[PDB]
Amino acid sequence: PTMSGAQLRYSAALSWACFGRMAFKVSVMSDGSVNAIWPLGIPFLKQKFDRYG
Amino acid sequence: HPVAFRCLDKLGLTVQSVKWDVGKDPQNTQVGDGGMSASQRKALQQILQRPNPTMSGAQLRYSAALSWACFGRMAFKVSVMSDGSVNAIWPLGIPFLKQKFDRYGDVESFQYGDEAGKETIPSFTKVEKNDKGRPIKNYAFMIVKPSINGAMNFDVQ
Amino acid sequence: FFTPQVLALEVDCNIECASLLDLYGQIEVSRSTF
Amino acid sequence: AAPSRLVQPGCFICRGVAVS
Amino acid sequence: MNFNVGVDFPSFIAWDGEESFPVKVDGFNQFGFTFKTIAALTAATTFNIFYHEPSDADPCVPGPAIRVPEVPFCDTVLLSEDGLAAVTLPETVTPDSFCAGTVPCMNGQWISIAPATGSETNAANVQITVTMKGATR
Amino acid sequence: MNFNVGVDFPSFIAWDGEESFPVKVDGFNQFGFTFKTIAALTAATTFNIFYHEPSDADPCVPGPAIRVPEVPFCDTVLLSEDGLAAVTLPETVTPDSFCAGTVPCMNGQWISIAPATGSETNAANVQITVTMKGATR
Amino acid sequence: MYFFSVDPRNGASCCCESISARPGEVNGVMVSYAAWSAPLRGHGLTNKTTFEIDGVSVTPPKVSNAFGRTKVGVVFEGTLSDLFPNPEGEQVEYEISELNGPSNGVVELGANGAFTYTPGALFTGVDRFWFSINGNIGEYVISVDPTTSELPQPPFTTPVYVPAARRSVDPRTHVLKFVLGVSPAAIPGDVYRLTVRQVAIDCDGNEFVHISCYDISIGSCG
Amino acid sequence: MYFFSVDPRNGASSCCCESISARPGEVNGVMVSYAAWSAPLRGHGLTNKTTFEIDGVSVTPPKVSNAFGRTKVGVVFEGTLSDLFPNPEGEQVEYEISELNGPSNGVVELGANGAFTYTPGALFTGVDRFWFSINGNIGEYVISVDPTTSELPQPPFTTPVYVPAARRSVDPRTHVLKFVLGVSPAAIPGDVYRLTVRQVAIDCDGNEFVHISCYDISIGSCG
Amino acid sequence: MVKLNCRPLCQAPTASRLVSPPCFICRGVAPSAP
Amino acid sequence: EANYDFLSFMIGAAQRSHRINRNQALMIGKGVNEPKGWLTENCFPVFQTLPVDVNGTSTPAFLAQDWRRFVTSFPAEYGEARSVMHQNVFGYLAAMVDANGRFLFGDGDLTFTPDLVRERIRISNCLPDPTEGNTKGGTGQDAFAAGSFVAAQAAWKTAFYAVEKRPMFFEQYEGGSSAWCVKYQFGAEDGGFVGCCEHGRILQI
Amino acid sequence: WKTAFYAVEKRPMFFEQYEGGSSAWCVKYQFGAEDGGFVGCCEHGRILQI
């Protein structure tokens, strides 16, 4: 809510243009039925790697 | 400014030229149609062509596009009577429009006025909904233009 | 241990004076020194 | 304007009999 | 039907007109003064506010008397030229009228009031006591 | 954050060890005493309670000293001999410790405390004070 | 505020520098040890400075100082005539310099070498006031005790002094700061000498000592 | 409005104390800028712990003496003016009550031979002064009107040159001291007094930096 | 920063008179005598 | 905290303080820093009544006969004009008595309450009243301080104009307000002047 | 008067036979009510005296 697919596409491509990255988040209920999508602020996103690759 | 005002009124004029209507959407996979009553859709057709008195839909389109171009924002006001049937639509002055956020992630109400005007119009998020979901009391829109680093509503224009 | 029943009255007694601003001629103006 | 008086007619009654 | 308001807001004497008294405010969290005169005053009287600290010899007896600093909120324009909080009982106070006041920030364990220099002969005609609020322990 | 509690439960002096002071309880509707000792006592100390009336001449100065009677409270046994109120600060009450008594039903408009006869020797070490509860102006 | 750039000891009228002083002032002094400490690359300076004051012209004081004692709240009275032994026979115009009066009480100077000192309400500590007999200035110190036992006896501050702990040294720019106060009993024309021993440190924890001197001249009105 | 930039105590840049010219009666203001001295001493600026002292190096003691009276509210007060001019030689006494320095909350009429009457204004209590001029020599006659209850205290017989009780100020943002200097109408032209000022700054932790300076006030008539 | 707050214990009454216009006199009666 | 909402009390106690101040200014405002009021400018043609000889004393007075000549003498060519006065004055006229003892208005009703808007009187009890509040005026002697003000009359829609430029506004004064204390700032801009000295009138003693 | 003086109502009267103290030869009743009032702000009222 408070965001349509047009705004999501805009934010995704903009972050893809400035940083070359795209991040998102899903809220799949229990059975592959995805409930909501959120675009993720790429500047202040930190990630942790596994041991292999 | 000469050139700035010229480009703005051109942009407002052209957008004001299009003609509205409610219609069946192409990507209608929802066989459980959201045309809740088919009368609110008629009234919505009424309101899109005849908004709040002393204002037409054309002037609404002009003010919306003009404000969207100037500030990157669009706000409005509805008067849904009791059954999802919208009564009237009002544009809101963005420069002196303030909003308050919830604890989790979003805006809940809009304050319009400093001292006497204190109508804390609820957002569409939290409002008395019908059994199907359609609201019953007033709310606002706060259409926003995206920007970098997310902050859907907390970001800079 | 005893909580008083907070009644919902608020006394005042503070006359303003009286209105006398509607007799005069009213003219809305612009930037000062008209 | 200078303060002007407001002399009004007094007790005017009679025209034919003077008092003693 | 009046209550034993003594417990739950007790009170003690802070200035009996002849000598001061340190009052413990540790067991409570909020407090204030209630000035009261016994005879017509002659000039504006000023009292100094002091806070104590538990003495090293015994933690149940106040040590030396330090002076509480002054805290302005926003509206303060006088600042009392010293940065040291003080009260000033104004002239023309008939001796059937009390006046209330307190410091915005306590510090230490005790509080004391004493007449400032110059107005030490008029303070003999006033009474200052302190009442606290709910007890923390 | 401490509140200015001088208004809304003010406090006044009633016995500074040398003189009683009638306190007006008309403008308020509840009141109580808060005893406090300054030094170790010698024996049990007994105090009388007095209530005053508006004087015949001046209507807000206290009149004579009338002693308020005492009433039982559904389980009384002692029943002070001459049906008259009295408070007895028990022996072996240390300093930095306060009690609180209160006459159950009020009469008059000025209340006062005085050291009972035969007990005014070690009565100079106590200091009774009063605190009211709620203005009714 | 004074400022001295010290010589870095590179082999490249008097030796000690000149500092003017006025009776009563309390000024500040800066020294820039950068020239001497920067080549000695280490951990900069260390707060191990030591001062020493000597007098090369004293003109011993005519009037002697004095000390008293009293309990808190209790008024203190004393004499002011047995402190000025006069060689000749003349009159004595006692005076309490208003600029150097007490700080927590008031003094009622009588007509003839007598005074009474009423301390401020609820005050326990030390207090000083600088009298002046026939122009000769001397301090009188009074200690108000908190009625229990006593307070120690203050050290009768010297004509020129450096406070106990108000010095600071910045190891990032090699500058030492301190305070130089001149008693109101200083005598114009006198000259003192302040020797400063500043210690640096190497990267391992050894010392580099450095010594300088300064000549203070007590001059009136600037 | 005088303005002095005090010496910065840096060992660098006739009488030492500066000069100040004043005319009897006037009340002026003076500014002092301690910026050159207290700005390098990085602290909390100045403090309102200044002290002033007025000493006279030339007085020429006055000829006429002053006088103090007592009276209540509304009651007329009478007094003479002949026992206030001790004349070593014989001369006439041209009594005069200057219109400029007359009473403030009352009214007086000068008699022909050392007489005057101070009828105070109705419903007024306090202290009121007025300056007489006996044969060019100037003095003051101070009267206090009591509200008929008990009595009033004694006023301090204002000095020739004075600094008001509490009108000083200081702005720690620009390191400037402001104070008032008032001269009595009885000051004799040609004399000179000395004013000393003790200004104390403060470091970051609450210690003190003292500073003393002096000013020569020469009371000169006609500017 | 202590800010005092004072109330009076015994309020006093406040009397006042109620002067009313007098009976008419008129500025000279016509039939009259010197 | 402090359950009683204080902010709403202050904004309410600011428009109120203005409302009485603007009314007070347009009447007796003195030149600089306040609009020149029509009471202090003194352009209105002012009429003063004559005294009456109470047993040869000539005290100032004001009788019902004066009030009629003051309202009817207005030239009807200026238009319809209203009269403003203090409520004690209107009570003063209501209590007149003739030599025989009867009342002149409402000849026996215990009260005189006429239609005011049918008589154009517009009582507003902050104009100066000649009764010194009350307890003065209407005497045999020792009252009625001569030279006072009683009432006015004018074609107010053209005899005095009110100027409004930018009325009251409230705003959080960003700057000087920190994360723990707010500083509000309110303001308004208005003024007034007289229109035509030759349209009003003033009655005096 | 609607805002010059106030009257407070809590409970009307009651009546009940006092059991303790009423033997089979005597009998004693017992009653009482509870009410009160105050004055709001005496700036809305006048008094005409002589």
Numbering used by the authors:
A (entry chain AE): 106 to 158
B (entry chain AF): 54 to 210
C (entry chain h1): 174 to 207
D (entry chain f1): 10 to 29
E (entry chain m2), F (entry chain l2): 1 to 137
G (entry chain P3): 1 to 12, 21 to 230
H (entry chain O3): 1 to 13, 21 to 230
I (entry chain e): 1 to 34
Which passages does the manuscript contain on this structure?
Caudovirales, the taxonomic order for the tailed double-stranded DNA bacteriophages, is characterized by the presence of a tail—a host cell attachment organelle that is connected to the genome-containing spherical or elongated capsid via a neck. We describe cryo-EM structures of the neck, the neck-capsid and neck-tail junctions, and capsid of the Agrobacterium phage Milano. The tail to capsid junction involves a symmetry mismatch that is bridged by the neck, and is therefore crucial for the assembly of tailed phage. The extensive network of disulfide bonds within and between neck, collar, capsid and tail provides an exceptional structural stability to Milano.
